[PDB]
């Protein structure tokens, strides 16, 4: 799915909707900044069937 921008220190989360069986996440950091990354959290709605 399309890239979701996230501003470090201001934004609390990113909102999306992605139904699937196996999930995959990718984080892309540009430069001109220093960042520490120590985990995350996934918030999911109730399941959407078995197909």
């Amino acid at each position: 799915k399309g890239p979701y921008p996230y501003r470090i220190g201001q934004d609390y989360k990113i909102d999306t909707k992605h139904v699937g069986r196996y999930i995959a996440l990718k984080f892309d950091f540009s430069s001109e900044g220093d960042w520490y990354f120590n985990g995350y959290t996934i918030e999911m709605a109730p399941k959407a069937g078995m197909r």
Partner: protein, 207 residues
């Protein structure tokens, strides 16, 4: 307004359900199922149709799109009367005893035909007012009156069909309830279109 034609409906359904793996044929099948279900429930003004039908062989052929009958009226040349329904036994008695009224007055249903008692030669015009089926929604027919009148009905029906397809229970029931509520609201709006007409067409012929 809102959803315009079938392509936007399919796009909106895909966006809401997020299932990008659905092909066009599956969406067409879902839309056809929704239309078929609607054909059995809706009797509204946009669904009505009145037209002149000829009489051949002492009978009138039922139109292929017929779903419900409202009225049959003879032409002024043959009496100009609103026909009344009689059973087979009454028809047989009238035929045997040569009732011979002035014009065409009675009708009955035999097979796929409407037989009028005062048998008239071929070529007798009648005015039939009835209800038809909803127009089919597909690529060849991108737009229909139902889609432009209340798009939520089609959106909810397609969503319910999709969730039936993916074998999910709770969401399918939820969207089915939503579709049923939308259909009920649409029917109720037309049922209360004219307050005066509500009293009539209910208490007719008691004896």
């Amino acid at each position: 307004a809102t959803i315009n034609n079938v392509t936007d409906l399919a796009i909106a359904a895909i966006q809401w359900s997020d299932r990008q793996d659905l092909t066009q044929e599956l969406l067409m099948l879902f839309i056809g199922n929704t239309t078929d279900r609607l054909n059995r429930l809706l009797r509204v003004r946009e669904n009505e149709h009145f037209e002149t039908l000829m009489a051949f062989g002492g009978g009138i052929e039922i139109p292929e799109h017929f779903v419900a009958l409202r009225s049959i009226t003879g032409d002024s040349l043959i009496g100009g009367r609103t026909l009344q329904y009689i059973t087979q036994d009454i028809f047989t008695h009238y035929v045997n005893y040569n009732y011979q009224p002035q014009g065409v007055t009675y009708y009955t249903r035999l097979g796929n035909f409407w037989r009028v008692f005062p048998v008239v030669p071929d070529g007798a015009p009648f005015i039939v007012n009835y209800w038809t089926v909803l127009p089919e929604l597909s690529l060849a027919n991108p737009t229909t009156w139902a889609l432009t009148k209340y798009p939520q009905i089609y959106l909810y029906g397609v969503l319910e069909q999709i969730y039936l397809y993916t074998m999910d229970e709770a969401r399918s029931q939820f969207w089915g309830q939503k579709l049923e509520r939308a259909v009920m609201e649409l029917q109720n709006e037309e049922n209360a279109a004219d307050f005066a007409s509500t009293r009539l067409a209910i208490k007719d012929i008691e004896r």
